[PDB]
Amino acid sequence: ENQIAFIPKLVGVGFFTSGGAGAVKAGEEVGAKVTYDGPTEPSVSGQVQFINNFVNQGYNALIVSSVSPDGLCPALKRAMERGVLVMTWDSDVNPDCRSYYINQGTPEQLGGLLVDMAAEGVKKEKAKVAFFYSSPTVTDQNAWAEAAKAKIAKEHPGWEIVTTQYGYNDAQKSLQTAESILQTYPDLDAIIAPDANALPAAAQAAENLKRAEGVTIVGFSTPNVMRPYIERGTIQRFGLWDVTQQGKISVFVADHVLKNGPMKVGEKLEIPGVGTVEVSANKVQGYDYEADGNGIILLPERTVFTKENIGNFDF
Numbered sequence: 001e002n003q004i005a006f007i008p009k010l011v012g013v014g015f016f017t018s019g020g021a022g023a024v025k026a027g028e029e030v031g032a033k034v035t036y037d038g039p040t041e042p043s044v045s046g047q048v049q050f051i052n053n054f055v056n057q058g059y060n061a062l063i064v065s066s067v068s069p070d071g072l073c074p075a076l077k078r079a080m081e082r083g084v085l086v087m088t089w090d091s092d093v094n095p096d097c098r099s100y101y102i103n104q105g106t107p108e109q110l111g112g113l114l115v116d117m118a119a120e121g122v123k124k125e126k127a128k129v130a131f132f133y134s135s136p137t138v139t140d141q142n143a144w145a146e147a148a149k150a151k152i153a154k155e156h157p158g159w160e161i162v163t164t165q166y167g168y169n170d171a172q173k174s175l176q177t178a179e180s181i182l183q184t185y186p187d188l189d190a191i192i193a194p195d196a197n198a199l200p201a202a203a204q205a206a207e208n209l210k211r212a213e214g215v216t217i218v219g220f221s222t223p224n225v226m227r228p229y230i231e232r233g234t235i236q237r238f239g240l241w242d243v244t245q246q247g248k249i250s251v252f253v254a255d256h257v258l259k260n261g262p263m264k265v266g267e268k269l270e271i272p273g274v275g276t277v278e279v280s281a282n283k284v285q286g287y288d289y290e291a292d293g294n295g296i297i298l299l300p301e302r303t304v305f306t307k308e309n310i311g312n313f314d315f
């Protein structure tokens, strides 16, 4: 059977654990050997070492959520020149460095979701807002944050973005950053935290400092991590998408391409228990690059979690 590596930014974070579980399950469904493995720290070096290991083992495909737009390119290009299928999921690399990106949404959809969620709680024309996510280099979150900032400048001209700070996919660093944000900005109105670790850290610090009544806190994380904060009312809402299914889609697409050849832009793949996915042009993500057998496969939906529906999810 095909050997397929599914690599997160780092392990030990619910988002990535859940994605990997979907990938591993799909392997069993589709008849492929799927290995979920990755570094304990979100480093370029760590990801490159795992990439090199799977390539050296003669794996047929790898699907990675990248901590960097370009840092993985040499390793991934080495992979592709040896006939290894290279794909990304969650966070992309430069399009000439992979084939397909299994993508939860466009920067506009996701940036727009962040802003809309924040706007629901701010309900004030003049406001002070902080951005808080993993790192200034990571592909996905910076794309979304840039799109969100652009929307804020246009839709909410009275909002002042007072700071952008980073938690580095780390509970302790994120906790310190969140407490620092709150203490520096006593009149802060919102925190937009598009990162699985940053969001719960912001919620926690707000509870620690009794700041939750005044700061609207939104972002992207998993239900199992955010549950306590939603149930207590510390935050009202946050977003994500079906990351388990995202992992499944990645594996099915990989296995299809291995068995049947490259998909082209416009082409569709039927996936049992999922539906139909389609290859979009890189243009949908804002890239200026196209090539045969290269593109972006968008997830069907994003979800907003509140106390009303969080009980319906377990990941």
Ligand SMILES: C[C@@]1(O)OC[C@H](O)C1(O)O
Pocket (backbone or CB within 6 Å): 009, 015, 065, 090, 091, 140, 141, 194, 195, 196, 197, 220, 221
């Ligand atoms: C869930 C999330 O926002 O945080 C970590 C992942 O890479 C993500 O999708 O960016």
